[PDB]
Amino acid sequence: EQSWIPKIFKKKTCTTFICQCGRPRTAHPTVWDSDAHTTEKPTDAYGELDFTGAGRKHSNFLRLSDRTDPAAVYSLVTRTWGFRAPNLVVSVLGGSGGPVLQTWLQDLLRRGLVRAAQSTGAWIVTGGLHTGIGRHVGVAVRDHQMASTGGTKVVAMGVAPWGVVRNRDTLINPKGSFPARYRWRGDPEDGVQFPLDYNYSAFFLVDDGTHGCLGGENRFRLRLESYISQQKTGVGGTGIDIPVLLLLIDGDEKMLTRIENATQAQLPCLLVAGSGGAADCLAETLEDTARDRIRRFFPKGDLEVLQAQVERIMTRKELLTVYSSEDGSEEFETIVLKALVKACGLDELRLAVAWNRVDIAQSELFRGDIQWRSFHLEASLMDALLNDRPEFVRLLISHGLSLGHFLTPMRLAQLYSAAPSNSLIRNLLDQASPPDVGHVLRMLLGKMCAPAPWSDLLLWALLLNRAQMAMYFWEMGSNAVSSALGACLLLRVMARLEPDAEEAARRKDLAFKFEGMGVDLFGECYRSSEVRAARLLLRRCPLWGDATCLQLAMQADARAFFAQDGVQSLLTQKWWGDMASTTPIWALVLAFFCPPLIYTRLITFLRRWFHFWGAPVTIFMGNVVSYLLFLLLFSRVLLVDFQPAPPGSLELLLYFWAFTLLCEELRQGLSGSLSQRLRLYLADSWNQCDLVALTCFLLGVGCRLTPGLYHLGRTVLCIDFMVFTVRLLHIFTVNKQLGPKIVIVSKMMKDVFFFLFFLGVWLVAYGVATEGLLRPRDSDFPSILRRVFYRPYLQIFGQIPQEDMDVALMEHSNCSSEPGFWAHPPGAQAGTCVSQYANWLVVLLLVIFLLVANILLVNLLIAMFSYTFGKVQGNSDLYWKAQRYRLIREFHSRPALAPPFIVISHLRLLLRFRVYLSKEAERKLLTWESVHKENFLLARARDKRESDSERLKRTSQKVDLALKQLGHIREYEQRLKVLER
Amino acid sequence: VDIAQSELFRGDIQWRSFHLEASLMDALLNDRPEFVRLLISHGLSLGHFLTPMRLAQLYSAAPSNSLIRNLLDQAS
Amino acid sequence: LLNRAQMAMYFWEMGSNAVSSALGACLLLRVMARLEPDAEEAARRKDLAFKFEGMGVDLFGECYRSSEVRAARLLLRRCPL
Amino acid sequence: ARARDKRESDSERLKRTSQKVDLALKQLGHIREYEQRLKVLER
Amino acid sequence: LRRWFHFWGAPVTIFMGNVVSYLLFLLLFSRVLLVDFQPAPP
């Protein structure tokens, strides 16, 4: 469907009468030569076809002249019409016997040609007319599609001459018949015009100007076949030439000429022996390698000039192949392969790769009569890598190919250049502008984790998002756990750079799979040996920028990797430093407050001094003690020593402590471009709280220094104290017991907000109603706000001042000049005088308020809290397990001195987890890890094979083999019983 | 359905259009979804098949006690 | 209208405006269910309406997963049928 | 009783069916080889 | 000027404006009920 089709495709129309044209003289405007009697004008018939509401999809059609080059038609079919490039083209010739065809020929068409074309994604070329062998081909295609009950449809092209097409006048539209309506059935059968077969996918109507005849499309069809034969398979021109093969089933004197013309173009020919006619005659003359033979198949013919034609046919006998009587319909592809190689004089492996037939390549490799040359396998592997065939690359690598010699910088550049034009990797490579793979890796991974043919292939597969090839290259790699974590990190990084949500989802799924397999491998390794697993987890991987597995898991945010017991035990062991992880807390506290006790047996391990005071847990304890002492000093200064006089010694000590806390905060924010780090620091909510605390402290001190703002400063500092104290929770998130609950506390804020909204609406309604009913005479604005919001709020907590709202509990007196009855409530802020008019309504409103607020809202909030807690328990636990490593690492680099003296450390740093292995130790560790990976993969494959689904599938296949053997046995039994008596 | 499928697989006789139309009409009237699927998939022209008379016959095949029968009677 | 589940499903699978036809079929079946004297016939019609709603949901989910803009345009257009 | 429960499970039935189909395939191969030999070599 | 109608025509901004208007209506109702609701003519 396009509007520019007439601009490049033209049709022929008669111009000179001489009838021989085929049309009456009314239709018109020695020999009727087309070039001397036709003119070319822009075409008028193109678009889609629907067979009068047929129960199937439309079919593309085009009307074109003979002189149109095949290139335009090929480009139109492949690009505009959406037809994929064919891996094979089979052109069917012949057809006789009227409407009926012999049964074995129909079986060879259905179980043979059509099945092979569907399997290899080939194009079946015939005449689109509902006649000759084209009708049989269409019937076979329909039967195969109905019987397959699935799979991809078979692509059928019909090249037919314009003029013999019945009811074709309805196809004419200058602007294109994109919606169409073609009546293929209902007309009386005639020997001149035939309808279009409804089983064909595309139609090419070659108009040579004749009103009706057969043979005008031979030139265009042959040129199109030759042009397709010269194209390249696969992505780009890397693949082999597209194979084409003409299948001859029957024919007459003209089919011999067509076969000769095809052979002149160097096209393979296949002749079905025993079918009679031209095919059988050619099969017999090929087997023999001829007046009687010509008479045997062509009675009353030109028995004198056909000998020269047979000689010309036999001049190129290498292109002719015979479909023997003993050859089955399921051997079709194999026979074709033989024909193709006989045409070559191109390998079977590359043909199998192009056709995506792994079994064909496996059978070819099993043939020991021919040894496979190394670069044959190299070319097959390169084709499989380019076309994304993981099974082929697995089979070729397992056969003994040298991958070290295979991979070259040119071949890697070719592999990278096969990326899609619209892919993300293509845009990244264009921005980076051999490809600049290292530059792209540095851009993606931030140079802190950016990167052995296996590793290069794994990176190539990950960048192009090829799941199966990436998995295979990981299974064949060396640094398996670190490569899995790095692959997860890279996929998660590239997912957020994807415009499509589907591509991002695929990348995230692949990252999850890589994380899962890394988790499984590390679990197996840790189960085997804890020490070697820890050494593998803490070592540096040069393939990933000398980053440990913990760093890669932190960058990738692999929460499942941190959540496993081995990593948590390693973190617990690292948290205690050189001390035993079984050390009781009380022993640590006693040794902390009694330093000389560190040399006794209660702690299991001058170097002992630094091994005790250097552990992260002791640093955490010292910081907790220091912060508690800081809070105690803050409270002492705020409640006692904060006089309007100039600051005393303790207040100056508090100032110095706050200054050292600020210096520690600055050091942590620096060591943890200026703008990027500032945004990183200010994105954290707890850093915002700490900034608020420090700013409030500075503002309070500044106001305190000013003589006229002292009171204000006090107020600020009071609130400031709270902001400090609520940071203790942030300190104790590292703790293994409080932290998992502190992270759940933040999930209840939505329930708290819903409770606050409902309570605020109810408080407004009830308070305004009660204030309007009571009509207090002290109607000051603060008093109104108090009695509307604050007094009803305290009734939720059991503070119900009945004497201030119930006139039965008051003293009735004339406190106002306004008409009515009034009472005096004894409350100080309850108004000096209230009305007695509808006090029963005030009491009823109090009852309803208590019911709604104290009973309904509170219990509803309890229910919501229970539901939310049960929902978020596990996710919060996983989050805490993931962040535990970051917390421990942050505490590891902390100075060993508590904040009050930490200035000393801050002077030694002013103006100024990894495990290292030997080469042989690293090699042994990698061998151990590879052995465990191999065992894990073998166990997984064994588990998959023994499942019930696979057993049932294999049983079905074996029953199929039994059925085939039974059919052969019964056929042979019938033959022996009948034909041998 | 297997008998009809085997008959359709017989290429020695071509099936006339209104033969398939009558078979499809019978299958539609008797509520045979497999038969209508098989007959439509064989290449029958549904645009020419459906006529106002045939649609009226299809609607008239409703049960006497059905809700649609009562609704059609009310609409009359 | 005749409450023929399999034929209705086949005609939906061979239709053109699939999502809108599924929603309209669900609407029509739910409307006719409450006009049924039998509870069994109403249950059958409600089951067929649920099946049509489910297949419309599946088709729209696939279309939206392929392309959000075209799915939104399909969801907001007017169906003359 | 435990052995009887294990034997009658679907997995064991499928495994035994696969083994019996394997035996059937072997016998079919022998039968077809003998059929070819008798049909070809004895005329 | 089309930006003006593209902002004030969105359903979310209409919702916000209606919420603000209803809050102001409730504030005026409370002000009248608690202060300005004397037996004198309105």
Curated annotation (Swiss-Prot), chain B:
Protein source organism: Homo sapiens
Binding-site list for ATP 2: R16, G43
Protein name: Transient receptor potential cation channel subfamily M member 4
Domain notes: TRPM4, is a temperature-sensitive ion channel, it adopts distinct conformations at different temperatures, markedly influencing where and how ligands interact with it. Decavanadate (a positive modulator), ATP (an inhibitor) and Ca(2+) bind to different locations of TRPM4 at physiological temperatures or at lower temperatures.
Protein task: Calcium-activated selective cation channel that mediates membrane depolarization. While it is activated by increase in intracellular Ca(2+), it is impermeable to it. Mediates transport of monovalent cations (Na(+) > K(+) > Cs(+) > Li(+)), leading to depolarize the membrane. It thereby plays a central role in cadiomyocytes, neurons from entorhinal cortex, dorsal root and vomeronasal neurons, endocrine pancreas cells, kidney epithelial cells, cochlea hair cells etc.
Post-translational modifications reported in the UniProt record: Phosphorylation by PKC leads to increase the sensitivity to Ca(2+).
Subunit: Homotetramer.
Domain of life (superkingdom): Eukaryota
Disease tied to this protein: Progressive familial heart block 1B: A cardiac bundle branch disorder characterized by progressive alteration of cardiac conduction through the His-Purkinje system, with a pattern of a right bundle-branch block and/or left anterior hemiblock occurring individually or together. It leads to complete atrio-ventricular block causing syncope and sudden death. Erythrokeratodermia variabilis et progressiva 6: A form of erythrokeratodermia variabilis et progressiva, a genodermatosis characterized by the coexistence of two independent skin lesions: transient erythema and hyperkeratosis that is usually localized but occasionally occurs in its generalized form. Clinical presentation varies significantly within a family and from one family to another. Palmoplantar keratoderma is present in around 50% of cases. EKVP6 inheritance is autosomal dominant.
